[PDB]
């Protein structure tokens, strides 16, 4: 039966919330951070829409982060804990069959109207209708309904989906009266379409001005309802946050070297080692940091991702052969200044990574699926090829050719061809920017040695997003990041239902009954021990199918910034909270 409700100020999918009800602020912030000053940021690519939820066009990241808010705010000094932001509290029955959020009486839109349950209901229905990521994420949430003056209740299709109250705190809340209203031209607004009309939110910043496709100026609102709320103390300090968009990374970095961009996150090991020979780098005007914080408690798979919707990549032997052709040792040494570590798990860098042979509960879970998983899961620990020397490079290429021969492809006149049709084995690697070319060219050169015509096709970010949405590629240089609590998002990465649905993150086109069963077991995991064992079992099965060519990664974010930006003395353990917890030194100096 139902019992007297228990209200919570926070939710956690792992452990207990660090902060008690009534806490004043997060520990890491500077409570006296001054309000003021300009922060100049850069963003790759462009934008052509301010619609924060429609998965169409190109939207600036600052819109959802600075103008809109969610029901709960995730603490960057904890793993999954979230605290009441637009919601004052959360209540749910023990069986997790529903979840109710009580909205804060003080929460207001920038136009002064209250944030209401009607807004939450509209936002929920709209994210599910217009955004494939949230459509999947909330697939087990049947409905949202107003159940009180300030209450929204979400109902679930099945009990014991433990993370649902937590993940429901992550979607932006949009103003129903505004989206169902009329613009200045007298035209009804439409959430189903892109827009360049500056959108209105409940967040700390408003869109003050913009140059479509080129820049956006966000301005801090002194009337932001949540300015003094515990999760916001010492946060949202810059008066103005300008974003300038760049399609050329070198032009973007030149803007940083000129002091026209204040902060730069460097994703290239060679650029980090060589591009900083400029005067401001020598006299303390620019600071460089290698920050591990945002990558702690994060699993990473970065890979060459073949598209299994295409006949050329359907054979596991072909996909395995491509790994034998990739030489990581040479790439790391000759081009990457030895900066990287080879990835060997979809949950690499966490306790969720499978290792060795399956044991205990992990082995038991796989045993109930023995007729449906690769035989290798019980006999063969996953390993990548290693190219310690030139004879080994040739031997690994011989192994690639052997796998291709088993798959029906043979060298004819030093070109790898389909043995029955004569059609050459060829593929295109789609890249989003020329900055990826130097990393990918060695792989192209390696497969060319065994008769494969691989070609790079570099496009711009707008074309890239449009092609990836429709899976219009043979292969991409892809990435999937994971938390320590796998859940409802997993079906967006490897679930069968996402293969033929545009806009999913199932880039390889994986469709497998055993994987689907493991994803279901993760979602409905009764406890942490069962979740960990099931996740390692899923990782082991994914790896044994050789769906991708795992690449590499590092354990720290490389950032450089101008010394007029101030950061908290100690960054939150699991993040940087940039730019929200940072502030202007020009302002502090009056």
């Amino acid at each position: 039966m139902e019992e007297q409700p228990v209200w919570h100020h926070a939710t956690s999918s792992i452990g207990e919330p660090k902060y008690k009800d009534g806490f004043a602020r997060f520990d890491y912030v500077n409570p006296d951070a001054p309000k003021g000053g300009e922060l100049r940021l850069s963003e790759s690519g462009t934008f052509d829409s301010f619609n924060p939820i429609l998965a169409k066009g190109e939207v600036a990241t600052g819109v959802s982060s600075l103008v809109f808010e969610t029901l709960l705010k995730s603490a960057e000094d904890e793993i999954t804990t979230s605290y009441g932001l637009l919601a004052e509290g959360i209540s749910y029955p023990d069986d997790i069959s529903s979840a109710t959020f009580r909205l804060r009486a003080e929460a207001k839109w920038a136009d002064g109207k209250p944030v209401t349950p009607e807004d939450v209901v509209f936002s929920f229905d709209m994210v599910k209708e217009h955004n494939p990521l949230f459509s999947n994420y909330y697939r087990h949430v049947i409905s949202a309904e107003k159940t009180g003056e300030r209450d929204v209740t979400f109902r679930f299709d099945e009990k014991n989906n433990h993370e649902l109250p937590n993940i429901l705190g992550q979607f932006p809340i949009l103003p129903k009266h505004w989206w169902e209203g009329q613009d200045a031209k007298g035209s009804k607004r439409d959430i189903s379409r892109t827009t360049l009309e500056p959108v209105m939110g409940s967040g700390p910043y408003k869109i003050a001005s913009f140059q479509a496709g080129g820049s956006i100026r966000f301005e801090l609102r002194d009337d932001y309802w949540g300015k003094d709320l515990n999760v916001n103390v010492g946060r949202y300090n810059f008066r103005t946050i300008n974003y300038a968009f760049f399609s050329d990374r070198s032009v973007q970095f030149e803007a940083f070297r000129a002091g026209n961009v204040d902060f730069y996150q460097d994703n290239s090991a060679s650029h980090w080692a060589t591009a900083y020979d400029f005067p401001a780098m020598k006299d303390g005007r620019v600071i460089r940091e290698e920050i591990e914080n945002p990558l702690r408690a994060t699993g990473i798979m970065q890979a060459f991702v073949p598209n299994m919707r295409r006949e050329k990549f359907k054979d596991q032997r072909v996909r395995q052969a491509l790994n034998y052709a990739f030489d990581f040792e040479d790439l790391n040494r000759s081009l990457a200044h030895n900066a990287f570590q080879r990835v060997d798990s979809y949950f690499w860098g966490t306790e969720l990574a499978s290792s060795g042979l399956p044991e205990g509960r992990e082995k038991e879970i796989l045993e109930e699926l023995k007729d449906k998983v690769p035989a290798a899961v019980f006999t063969t620990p996953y390993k990548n090829p290693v190219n310690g020397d030139p004879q080994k490079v040739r031997d690994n290429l011989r192994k690639a050719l052997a796998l291709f021969k088993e798959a029906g492809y043979e060298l004819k006149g030093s070109r790898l061809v389909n043995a029955k049709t004569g059609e050459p084995f060829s593929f295109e690697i789609l890249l989003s920017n020329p900055t990826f070319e130097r990393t990918v060219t060695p792989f192209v050169n390696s497969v060319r040695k065994i008769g494969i015509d691989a070609r790079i096709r570099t496009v711009d970010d707008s074309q890239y997003t449009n092609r990836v949405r429709s899976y219009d590629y043979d292969m991409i240089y892809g990435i999937w990041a994971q938390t320590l609590v796998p859940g409802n998002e997993q079906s967006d990465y490897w679930g069968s239902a996402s293969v033929n649905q545009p806009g999913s993150r199932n880039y390889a086109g994986i469709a497998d009954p055993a994987i689907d069963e493991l994803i279901r077991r993760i979602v409905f995991a009764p406890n942490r021990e069962e979740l960990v064992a099931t996740t390692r079992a899923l990782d082991r099965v994914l790896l044994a199918h050789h769906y991708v060519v795992p690449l590499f990664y590092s354990k720290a974010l490389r950032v450089a910034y101008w010394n007029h930006l101030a950061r908290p003395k100690e960054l939150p353990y699991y993040g940087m909270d940039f730019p929200d917890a940072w502030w202007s030194k020009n302002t502090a100096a009056k």
């Binding site: 290239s268 990435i479 590092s554």
Partner: peptide, 5 residues
Amino acid sequence: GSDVA
């Protein structure tokens, strides 16, 4: 984001 050489 993606890390490169």
